[PDB]
Amino acid sequence: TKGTSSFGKRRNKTHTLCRRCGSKAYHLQKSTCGKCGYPAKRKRKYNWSAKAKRRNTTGTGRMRHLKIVYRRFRHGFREGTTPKPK
Amino acid sequence: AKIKARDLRGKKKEELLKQLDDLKVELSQLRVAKVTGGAASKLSKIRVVRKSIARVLTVINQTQKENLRKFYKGKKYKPLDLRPKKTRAMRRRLNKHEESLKTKKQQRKERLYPLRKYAVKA
Amino acid sequence: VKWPRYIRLQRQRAILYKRLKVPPAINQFTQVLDRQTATQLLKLAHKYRPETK
Amino acid sequence: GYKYIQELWRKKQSDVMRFLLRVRCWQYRQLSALHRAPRPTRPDKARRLGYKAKQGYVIYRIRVRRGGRKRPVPKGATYGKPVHHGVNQLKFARSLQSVAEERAGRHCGALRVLNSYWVGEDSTYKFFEVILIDPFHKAIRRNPDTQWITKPVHKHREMRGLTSAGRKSRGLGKGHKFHHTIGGSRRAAWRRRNTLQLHRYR
Amino acid sequence: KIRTSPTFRRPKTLRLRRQPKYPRKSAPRRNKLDHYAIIKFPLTTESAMKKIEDNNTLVFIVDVKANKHQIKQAVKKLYDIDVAKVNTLIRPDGEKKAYVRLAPDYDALDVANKIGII
Amino acid sequence: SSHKTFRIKRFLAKKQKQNRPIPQWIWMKTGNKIRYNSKRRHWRRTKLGL
RNA sequence: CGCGACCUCAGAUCAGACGUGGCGACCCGCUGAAUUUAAGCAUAUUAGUCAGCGGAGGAAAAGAAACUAACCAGGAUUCCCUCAGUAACGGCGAGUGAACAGGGAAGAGCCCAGCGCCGAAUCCCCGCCCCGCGGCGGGGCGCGGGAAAUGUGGCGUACGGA
RNA sequence: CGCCGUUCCGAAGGGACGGGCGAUGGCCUCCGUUGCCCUCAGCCGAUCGAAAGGGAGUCGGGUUCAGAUCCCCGAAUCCG
Ligand SMILES: [Mg+2]
Ligand SMILES: [Mg+2]
Ligand SMILES: [Mg+2]
Ligand SMILES: [Mg+2]
Ligand SMILES: [Mg+2]
Ligand SMILES: [Mg+2]
Ligand SMILES: [Mg+2]
Ligand SMILES: [Mg+2]
Ligand SMILES: [Mg+2]
Ligand SMILES: [Mg+2]
Ligand SMILES: [Mg+2]
Ligand SMILES: [Mg+2]
Ligand SMILES: [Mg+2]
Ligand SMILES: [Mg+2]
Ligand SMILES: [Mg+2]
Ligand SMILES: [Mg+2]
Ligand SMILES: [Mg+2]
Ligand SMILES: [Mg+2]
Ligand SMILES: [Mg+2]
Ligand SMILES: [Mg+2]
Ligand SMILES: [Mg+2]
Ligand SMILES: [Mg+2]
Ligand SMILES: [Mg+2]
Ligand SMILES: [Mg+2]
Ligand SMILES: [Zn+2]
């Protein structure tokens, strides 16, 4: 009865998609995420999981501002200039 | 007709917004042709008109930004958009004058004991 | 009245300055210049004020 | 003058200074735990520790509870060998003055801690005063005698143990007493002693 | 001025208004929910052609962020036709279908004849 | 259920539009290996997480 | 009663700034084990290590002796060879374990408070002029406002200095 | 890092009528606006917590291959 019988009672979910990390780990009762600790300011990460870091690091996403900073860097972040016109 | 960005810079703000308000109607008529079924000669003009709108709005924002930083060319406080945007640590430095500042004690040391140029005989 | 903390603090520090045995070195500041000598004093100390900006 | 307040603040066992330190400690015991002071309580000790009476210099007064560091564990039960059954009589390795300077350097994270000093204590509290500098004022930016504090290297001097009260806790120094901190720090000494140099040719 | 009540309440002081010395952003951001972006295309399905023919309505795939007010006031701009009512619904596809019912005198079938869908 | 939310109706819509076969014009390309769509999903077997 | 100071303390979508979070190989500050070794084990060892927390930089930290020495003396810090598996610690068991000198890479010094001297001789802010203007400055005006005598600037700091 | 704590060590109300002063837009008549005082004010704790608790107000008929107290027609109703 502890098995197949009590596997039907599973109907109300514990977690939902966190809004900061898009993972399905937001405990609806504790109101905090198990993947990023959303209500806490600091993203939670431990060294004892070397791989969960490599799944969430500065390369894993779009770097929509870093991949351009790495390009404006090769010229000391020049500003207010354009090439000489034709 | 190939809308180049060169012959768009002399026109006036409302002589640009009339072109915008005509290109958006040409878009609406092309997104209608797409759903009613239209010739590929028309369907392929969507990529041409979305980019004509892109060129127009680009020249509009460029003239507006040049006018803005000309109005604030010599002013002291200017919008954070016209302020030079570099890295946070590069914007939170000391000025080249704060770097090039010296106490009167070092303006007196550097003066009374300069670094002399010399050689030695071998 | 229930006063704010800073008011009650300074109002009962003026009381601690009446309950605590104040050494004569601090108590020698209560015996001060009178109200008649003060006038003539500042009268003389007005002809020798420093210069302004 | 300043040497008169100096030689006066060394007779803390006298009458006048045990009255003053006691009315000060009573008044401090009524305010908040971390509050800004209007002006330096000890102007002489503040000059000695680097306080120029000019804009940008700030003084925070802060109180800390005396006593050692009980180990944060369950009821008793520090699971380990009897060596580490100690919870009660343990001591903390950073002085209460460094803890005052870092509760100020954390409550107000924009300002840079310079030093701090003792302004009173009782059985359950120690009262310090932390000399915070505002590193983006122009009285500090332009004045070149003190524009070193405005560089990013001196962020959180007290979280990195570079203030006076902090440096006093890392056991560094030159001599035959300070051998275990030859090199950068205790861990940069430990690394070089516990590091096996394996040359190419052995 | 006697203290009539034993509760010292904080006195109300004066509060000024923001007189900035420089606007943060240089220019107001243009309204990206234009009258044109708010209406993408119509539908030509016999589920909406019976609405046009019988119910004298039209079926547009409007932007999802659009109110029935923005829709009404943007069909009265792109097509110059007074509107009876608007009924929106978000499809399982994701887009927001909108049934716009024209005034009694205006004929949907004859404004769809105009704009193209017929 | 039938008492969805907006974020969830929208996530189901995305999971509906990702559930279609590769366009037929796409394996005459040159640098091509995709024989078929392998990221497909059946509503019965795999249950979309959530 | 009122008026005006000063001190202490609040309120602002007050004018202008600043912090927050991420990364984390290396670095700085704390917290801190137990597997294992001892042919058991309890001190020791593993180890100030794994985990944990905080803070940075392109390096960090340290740094111009309250030093080493006992010589015919050396002279900031950091690094390598060597001292040295040494002196020493240790159920003196298991095991642990530096420094001085010397040869090299590099090489650089300084600054305050205080004590005195000077008419506060000093600093920040706003308004206007001209320039510079994409690292917000230079010069001139303002019986313009503040900070500061509960101490600003110049000389000056243990090698002595005035 | 944070934890404790929810009326407890708190200057915790940015509100209202009337009056006086001041300004504003127009049949500048007479209301409305916002600036300054005068008068008055309890509260009890920011905020969250129920598609079964509390919670104003829509019913008939027709219609689709799949939607109807939702669309069409006809009758109402609450709130501002
Ligand atoms: Mg539960
Ligand atoms: Mg240092
Ligand atoms: Mg000591
Ligand atoms: Mg403001
Ligand atoms: Mg064993
Ligand atoms: Mg064994
Ligand atoms: Mg065993
Ligand atoms: Mg042991
Ligand atoms: Mg050891
Ligand atoms: Mg320790
Ligand atoms: Mg670790
Ligand atoms: Mg952390
Ligand atoms: Mg950080
Ligand atoms: Mg950096
Ligand atoms: Mg350094
Ligand atoms: Mg020395
Ligand atoms: Mg040496
Ligand atoms: Mg040596
Ligand atoms: Mg050499
Ligand atoms: Mg000097
Ligand atoms: Mg001096
Ligand atoms: Mg709590
Ligand atoms: Mg609610
Ligand atoms: Mg209910
Ligand atoms: Zn999450």
CSV table of C-alpha atoms in Angstrom, one decimal, chain D residues 39-198:
chain,number,residue,atom,x,y,z
D,39,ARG,CA,32.0,64.9,15.8
D,40,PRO,CA,35.0,62.9,17.0
D,41,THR,CA,34.7,62.2,20.7
D,42,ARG,CA,38.5,62.1,21.1
D,43,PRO,CA,39.8,64.8,18.8
D,44,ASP,CA,43.4,64.1,19.7
D,45,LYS,CA,43.3,60.3,19.3
D,46,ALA,CA,41.4,61.0,16.1
D,47,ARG,CA,44.2,63.2,14.7
D,48,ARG,CA,46.7,60.6,15.8
D,49,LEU,CA,44.7,58.0,13.9
D,50,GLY,CA,44.4,60.2,10.8
D,51,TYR,CA,41.3,62.4,11.2
D,52,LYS,CA,41.6,65.8,9.5
D,53,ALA,CA,38.7,68.0,10.5
D,54,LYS,CA,37.5,68.5,6.9
D,55,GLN,CA,34.5,67.4,4.9
D,56,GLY,CA,34.3,63.8,4.0
D,57,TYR,CA,35.5,62.5,7.3
D,58,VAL,CA,32.7,60.7,9.2
D,59,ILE,CA,32.7,59.1,12.7
D,60,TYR,CA,30.4,56.2,13.5
D,61,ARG,CA,30.0,55.0,17.1
D,62,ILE,CA,29.3,51.3,17.5
D,63,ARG,CA,28.9,49.0,20.4
D,64,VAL,CA,29.7,45.2,20.6
D,65,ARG,CA,28.9,42.6,23.2
D,66,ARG,CA,31.9,41.4,25.1
D,67,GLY,CA,32.8,37.8,25.7
D,68,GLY,CA,34.1,34.8,23.8
D,69,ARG,CA,32.7,32.9,20.8
D,70,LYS,CA,30.4,30.1,21.8
D,71,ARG,CA,30.5,27.5,19.1
D,72,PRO,CA,27.4,27.5,16.9
D,73,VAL,CA,26.3,23.9,17.1
D,74,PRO,CA,23.3,21.9,18.4
D,75,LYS,CA,22.7,21.4,22.1
D,76,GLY,CA,26.1,19.9,22.8
D,77,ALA,CA,27.1,17.5,20.2
D,78,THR,CA,30.1,18.8,18.3
D,79,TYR,CA,30.6,15.5,16.5
D,80,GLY,CA,34.4,14.9,16.6
D,81,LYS,CA,37.3,13.7,18.6
D,82,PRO,CA,37.5,14.9,22.2
D,83,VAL,CA,40.1,17.4,21.1
D,84,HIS,CA,37.3,19.6,19.6
D,85,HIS,CA,34.7,19.1,22.3
D,86,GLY,CA,35.3,22.8,23.3
D,87,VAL,CA,32.4,25.2,22.9
D,88,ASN,CA,32.4,27.5,26.0
D,89,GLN,CA,35.8,28.8,26.7
D,90,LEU,CA,36.7,29.4,23.0
D,91,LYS,CA,38.1,32.8,21.8
D,92,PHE,CA,37.7,34.6,18.5
D,93,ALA,CA,40.8,35.4,16.5
D,94,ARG,CA,39.7,38.9,15.5
D,95,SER,CA,39.5,41.6,18.1
D,96,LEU,CA,36.3,43.3,19.0
D,97,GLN,CA,37.7,46.4,17.5
D,98,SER,CA,38.0,44.8,14.1
D,99,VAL,CA,34.5,43.5,14.5
D,100,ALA,CA,33.3,47.1,15.2
D,101,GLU,CA,35.2,48.3,12.2
D,102,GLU,CA,33.6,45.7,10.0
D,103,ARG,CA,30.1,46.1,11.2
D,104,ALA,CA,30.6,49.8,10.3
D,105,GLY,CA,32.3,48.9,7.0
D,106,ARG,CA,29.3,46.7,6.2
D,107,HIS,CA,26.4,48.8,7.5
D,108,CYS,CA,27.8,51.7,5.5
D,109,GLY,CA,29.5,50.0,2.5
D,110,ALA,CA,30.2,53.2,0.5
D,111,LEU,CA,32.7,54.6,3.0
D,112,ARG,CA,36.2,53.4,3.5
D,113,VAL,CA,37.3,52.5,7.1
D,114,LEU,CA,40.6,54.2,8.2
D,115,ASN,CA,40.9,53.3,11.9
D,116,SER,CA,38.9,53.2,15.1
D,117,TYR,CA,39.4,53.7,18.8
D,118,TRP,CA,37.9,52.9,22.2
D,119,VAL,CA,35.5,55.3,23.9
D,120,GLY,CA,34.0,53.2,26.6
D,121,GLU,CA,33.0,49.7,27.9
D,122,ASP,CA,31.1,48.0,30.6
D,123,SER,CA,30.5,44.3,31.6
D,124,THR,CA,28.4,43.6,28.5
D,125,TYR,CA,29.5,46.1,25.9
D,126,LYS,CA,32.6,47.7,24.3
D,127,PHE,CA,32.1,51.0,22.5
D,128,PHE,CA,34.3,52.0,19.6
D,129,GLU,CA,34.4,54.9,17.1
D,130,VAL,CA,35.2,54.2,13.4
D,131,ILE,CA,36.8,56.8,11.2
D,132,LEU,CA,35.0,56.4,7.8
D,133,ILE,CA,36.1,58.4,4.8
D,134,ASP,CA,33.8,59.3,1.9
D,135,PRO,CA,36.0,58.4,-1.1
D,136,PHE,CA,34.0,60.3,-3.7
D,137,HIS,CA,34.1,63.8,-2.2
D,138,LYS,CA,36.3,66.4,-3.9
D,139,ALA,CA,38.0,67.4,-0.6
D,140,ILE,CA,39.4,63.9,-0.7
D,141,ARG,CA,39.6,63.4,-4.5
D,142,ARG,CA,41.6,66.5,-5.2
D,143,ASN,CA,43.8,66.7,-2.1
D,144,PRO,CA,46.7,64.4,-3.2
D,145,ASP,CA,47.8,63.6,0.4
D,146,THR,CA,44.9,61.2,0.8
D,147,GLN,CA,43.8,60.2,-2.7
D,148,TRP,CA,45.3,56.8,-2.2
D,149,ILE,CA,42.2,55.7,-0.3
D,150,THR,CA,40.1,56.2,-3.4
D,151,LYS,CA,41.7,53.5,-5.5
D,152,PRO,CA,39.9,50.1,-5.9
D,153,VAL,CA,42.7,48.3,-4.0
D,154,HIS,CA,41.5,49.6,-0.6
D,155,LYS,CA,37.9,48.3,-0.9
D,156,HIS,CA,36.9,46.9,2.5
D,157,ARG,CA,40.2,47.3,4.2
D,158,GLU,CA,38.6,45.8,7.3
D,159,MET,CA,37.1,42.8,5.5
D,160,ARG,CA,40.6,42.1,4.2
D,161,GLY,CA,42.3,42.9,7.5
D,162,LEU,CA,44.4,45.9,6.5
D,163,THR,CA,43.4,48.4,9.2
D,164,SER,CA,45.4,48.8,12.3
D,165,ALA,CA,43.1,46.7,14.6
D,166,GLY,CA,43.0,44.0,11.9
D,167,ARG,CA,46.7,43.9,11.2
D,168,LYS,CA,47.3,43.5,14.9
D,169,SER,CA,45.4,40.2,14.7
D,170,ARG,CA,47.3,38.5,11.8
D,171,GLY,CA,50.5,38.1,13.8
D,172,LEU,CA,52.6,39.7,11.1
D,173,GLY,CA,55.8,41.6,11.6
D,174,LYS,CA,59.6,41.3,11.4
D,175,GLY,CA,61.5,39.4,14.0
D,176,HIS,CA,62.2,36.0,15.6
D,177,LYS,CA,58.7,36.1,17.1
D,178,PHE,CA,56.9,36.4,13.7
D,179,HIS,CA,58.5,33.6,11.7
D,180,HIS,CA,55.2,31.9,10.8
D,181,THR,CA,54.2,35.0,8.6
D,182,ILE,CA,57.3,35.3,6.4
D,183,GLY,CA,55.9,36.2,3.0
D,184,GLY,CA,52.6,37.8,2.3
D,185,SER,CA,50.5,36.2,5.1
D,186,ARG,CA,50.1,33.1,7.2
D,187,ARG,CA,48.7,31.2,4.3
D,188,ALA,CA,51.3,32.4,1.8
D,189,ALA,CA,54.0,31.2,4.2
D,190,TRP,CA,52.2,27.9,4.7
D,191,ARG,CA,51.9,27.5,1.0
D,192,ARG,CA,55.6,27.9,0.3
D,193,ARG,CA,56.6,25.7,3.2
D,194,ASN,CA,54.0,23.1,2.1
D,195,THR,CA,54.8,23.3,-1.6
D,196,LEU,CA,57.1,20.9,-3.3
D,197,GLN,CA,59.4,22.6,-5.8
D,198,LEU,CA,59.9,20.1,-8.6
